[PDB]
Design a protein around this ligand. Sequence first.
Ligand SMILES: *[C@@H]1O[C@H](CO)[C@@H](O[C@@H]2O[C@H](CO)[C@@H](O)[C@H](O)[C@H]2NC(C)=O)[C@H](O)[C@H]1NC(C)=O
Ligand SMILES: *[C@@H]1O[C@H](CO)[C@@H](O)[C@H](O)[C@H]1NC(C)=O
Ligand SMILES: *[C@@H]1O[C@H](CO)[C@@H](O)[C@H](O)[C@H]1NC(C)=O
Ligand SMILES: *[C@@H]1O[C@H](CO)[C@@H](O)[C@H](O)[C@H]1NC(C)=O
Ligand SMILES: *[C@@H]1O[C@H](CO)[C@@H](O)[C@H](O)[C@H]1NC(C)=O
Ligand SMILES: *[C@@H]1O[C@H](CO)[C@@H](O)[C@H](O)[C@H]1NC(C)=O
Ligand SMILES: *[C@@H]1O[C@H](CO)[C@@H](O)[C@H](O)[C@H]1NC(C)=O
Ligand SMILES: *[C@@H]1O[C@H](CO)[C@@H](O)[C@H](O)[C@H]1NC(C)=O
Ligand SMILES: *[C@@H]1O[C@H](CO)[C@@H](O)[C@H](O)[C@H]1NC(C)=O
Ligand SMILES: *[C@@H]1O[C@H](CO)[C@@H](O)[C@H](O)[C@H]1NC(C)=O
Ligand SMILES: *[C@@H]1O[C@H](CO)[C@@H](O)[C@H](O)[C@H]1NC(C)=O
Lengths: 65, 413, 98, 98, 49, 48
Amino acid sequence: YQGVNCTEVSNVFQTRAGCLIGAEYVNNSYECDIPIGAGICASYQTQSIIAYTMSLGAENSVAYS
Amino acid sequence: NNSIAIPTNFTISVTTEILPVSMTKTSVDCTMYICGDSTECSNLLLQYGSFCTQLKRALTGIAVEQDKNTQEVFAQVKQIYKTPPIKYFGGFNFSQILPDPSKPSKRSFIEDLLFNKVTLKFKGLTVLPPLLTDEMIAQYTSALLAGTITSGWTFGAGAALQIPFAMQMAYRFNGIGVTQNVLYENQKLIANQFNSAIGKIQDSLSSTASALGKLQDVVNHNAQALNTLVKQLSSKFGAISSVLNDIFSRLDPPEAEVQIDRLITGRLQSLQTYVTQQLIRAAEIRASANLAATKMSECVLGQSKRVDFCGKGYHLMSFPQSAPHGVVFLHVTYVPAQEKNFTTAPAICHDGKAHFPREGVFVSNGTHWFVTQRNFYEPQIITTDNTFVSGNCDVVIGIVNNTVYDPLQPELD
Amino acid sequence: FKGLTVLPPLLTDEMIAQYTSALLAGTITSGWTFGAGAALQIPFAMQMAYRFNGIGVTQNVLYENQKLIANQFNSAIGKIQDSLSSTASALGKLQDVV
Amino acid sequence: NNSIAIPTNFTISVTTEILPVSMTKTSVDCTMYICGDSTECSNLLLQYGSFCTQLKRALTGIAVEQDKNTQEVFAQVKQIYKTPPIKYFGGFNFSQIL
Amino acid sequence: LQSLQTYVTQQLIRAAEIRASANLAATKMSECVLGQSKRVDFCGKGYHL
Amino acid sequence: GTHWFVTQRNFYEPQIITTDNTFVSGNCDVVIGIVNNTVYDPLQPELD
Ligand SMILES: *[C@@H]1O[C@H](CO)[C@@H](O[C@@H]2O[C@H](CO)[C@@H](O)[C@H](O)[C@H]2NC(C)=O)[C@H](O)[C@H]1NC(C)=O
Ligand SMILES: *[C@@H]1O[C@H](CO)[C@@H](O)[C@H](O)[C@H]1NC(C)=O
Ligand SMILES: *[C@@H]1O[C@H](CO)[C@@H](O)[C@H](O)[C@H]1NC(C)=O
Ligand SMILES: *[C@@H]1O[C@H](CO)[C@@H](O)[C@H](O)[C@H]1NC(C)=O
Ligand SMILES: *[C@@H]1O[C@H](CO)[C@@H](O)[C@H](O)[C@H]1NC(C)=O
Ligand SMILES: *[C@@H]1O[C@H](CO)[C@@H](O)[C@H](O)[C@H]1NC(C)=O
Ligand SMILES: *[C@@H]1O[C@H](CO)[C@@H](O)[C@H](O)[C@H]1NC(C)=O
Ligand SMILES: *[C@@H]1O[C@H](CO)[C@@H](O)[C@H](O)[C@H]1NC(C)=O
Ligand SMILES: *[C@@H]1O[C@H](CO)[C@@H](O)[C@H](O)[C@H]1NC(C)=O
Ligand SMILES: *[C@@H]1O[C@H](CO)[C@@H](O)[C@H](O)[C@H]1NC(C)=O
Ligand SMILES: *[C@@H]1O[C@H](CO)[C@@H](O)[C@H](O)[C@H]1NC(C)=O
């Protein structure tokens, strides 16, 4: 529900884009499958619908001397 | 006839470029705009066909295109490179472009000024949030800066390979046609000039009134389009009243049907005009975003030989910075200065043979001929190592007489 | 009329011709130097030798075939006039715009 | 797999490229075109809203765009360079272009 | 009003096309007149001088 | 047909094969199609 603070009208999660119902939030970061908005994407767990924050890429550090 | 000017010094400079990348994402519902809270009109609105589906499809397409543009411009790098804790790079100071260690917003100070300088659920009208937040775009920019500072151009064409920044600058001077010893004997001066230029850009961005007008233009265009779309809802369009409830109250349904049709036609025409203008503006913004992505690749990840693509002067390197609806490029270039006049010749006639310079030009100092590079005055004795011989002295027009030193000549024994 | 008018352009044709003359003079007299900083003079023969070095041909080729190269350039420039004059659709794009 | 071809001569050629840069700047009058300078129609026309402001804004933007196009294409040179009075450039004929 | 709106829309599309052509012409000026171009067939057929 | 020279790619300007216009890289049994010829050393006749 875009633009609705769903404290008004299974898992219920609140996003800057809206309120998301039927998707479980997980703290792992994956590549974006279905873009929802405001940096949050959703995908099929493979099993259930999950929501997460997309990862930009792998972290790397170059040994500068 | 035989006059040439060669610069004896140089001034490295930094310039700023601003490019819009994307615009706001807007969604429109017909019924609420055309005639809301009135199911009587909602019954008649369905009679016109599939205009709403077309309008929604167009708006959704031009909304997805914005995320496509942002991803194309900023997601050039595959890995998030990190800068070393020791911020010493041979005298060059990057504090104004690297992220702030105090971590107020993980933004550079110039990025802070860019975000502060430019300004950034209606009656049926909504706006959608972009997929990438400002923090993620700033993180992408930080990764690009770390990669381009630590490794050079190598990170953009394969595996990232570290190299000291002084040797990278020597590479780039070799690229612009100047020998590396010019950097190695003027490293301190070049570092001082670079720091001063960065400070001057800092001040110029802080002080200029209309430096970022290219993004204010987009923001104001969107605002005026939305405002005029809302304002058009109060027009009569030939009916007795602009209030649908009023025309229902004051007239019979058979006669009120014509006025309802007039209102429907006017509002549909206004909304279609809005959609068409949005499509044209989206095409323009897509062209700008393609230009920005091309500039990112060419100037940031490499060293372009194109003349004015990455700033005036001979291009050395560029640094990207983030803006609320665009990207900012800081082009570091090489500008010659303090030129002097000499008299020149095309070839040297020695022993009945014509000698041509290998990678330089002949200059005479008035009475003593030397060989020097074109972009910097550095005379040297003419020998057989820096010249090649081809032909006689009778074919070249303007040949001059001089002796060519032989390095192996003194070894007579 | 019926309310439909045409506005004059800001730059007259004389000003555009002046800009073009400035560009031609700069490129003839200083090479590509005038487009990257201070304009530095250089004889045209040496500039064209540099431009041959830029395409992978040594400069002694020009310094030995200067007269032939000049004659070929002159003939091509002379033929451009007749090529533009005789063709009936050389400037088709601007006519299409108008 | 053991044969090559190497040119022994060369020809220099001149070709022309034509590119439109700008188009005509036009203006419109709502009342004159639509109502035909009739007073009865003008009072009814203002009842239709702000379409005329939109059209005027669009055409003004187009005109400014044309001016910007011309300035961008032709005004790239900072200074007005002048050719030397003695027009000898080592055998070349630039009279057709000067 | 419909006729005038159609005219304005066509003018906007043509203006966008002319802007693209003008950008191309400016790039051609900068890369072919103010320098020597190594891009193939960008400043004519052959090795650009 | 009988002798070997070195020419620039875009123009026919034959030159005698010397040590100035050639560089040595390894032994001559790895390159496919390598032929037999002499290389002229300008230093030896001078005998510095
Ligand atoms: C290379 O080509 C040029 C161009 O055809 C030749 O120059 C011509 O030579 C003939 C015969 O000497 C003259 O009649 C023409 O007037 C020349 N043309 C020009 C434009 O001057 C040149 O001889 C050729 N050189 C070689 C080695 O083949
Ligand atoms: C929704 O309301 C709660 C409580 O009023 C608030 O904390 C939260 O920030 C709101 N969500 C948004 C997206 O504003
Ligand atoms: C994700 O982290 C939040 C914050 O602690 C926590 O409340 C939530 O249970 C976590 N969810 C999962 C699937 O780990
Ligand atoms: C002009 O200078 C060129 C370059 O040295 C020379 O070849 C030519 O003969 C000169 N002409 C005159 C008239 O001095
Ligand atoms: C880099 O510049 C900033 C601001 O000019 C200055 O505070 C800082 O000390 C400089 N870095 C070093 C290592 O001096
Ligand atoms: C060129 O520089 C020299 C200084 O060596 C000066 O004497 C001469 O007048 C200058 N010529 C021009 C045309 O500037
Ligand atoms: C260069 O010219 C100056 C002035 O003509 C002269 O004093 C100097 O000796 C010259 N350079 C050399 C290496 O002779
Ligand atoms: C150069 O010297 C030779 C003799 O070694 C002479 O014949 C020739 O005329 C000289 N060139 C000039 C331009 O004086
Ligand atoms: C060259 O081509 C011919 C014809 O296919 C072939 O027989 C010969 O082996 C080739 N030479 C080499 C060195 O591959
Ligand atoms: C160069 O060509 C032009 C064009 O025909 C000609 O008028 C001029 O006389 C030529 N230059 C000389 C010095 O003859
Ligand atoms: C080249 O010469 C070497 C020794 O001089 C000889 O062993 C070899 O067979 C020769 N190669 C050919 C193809 O004749």
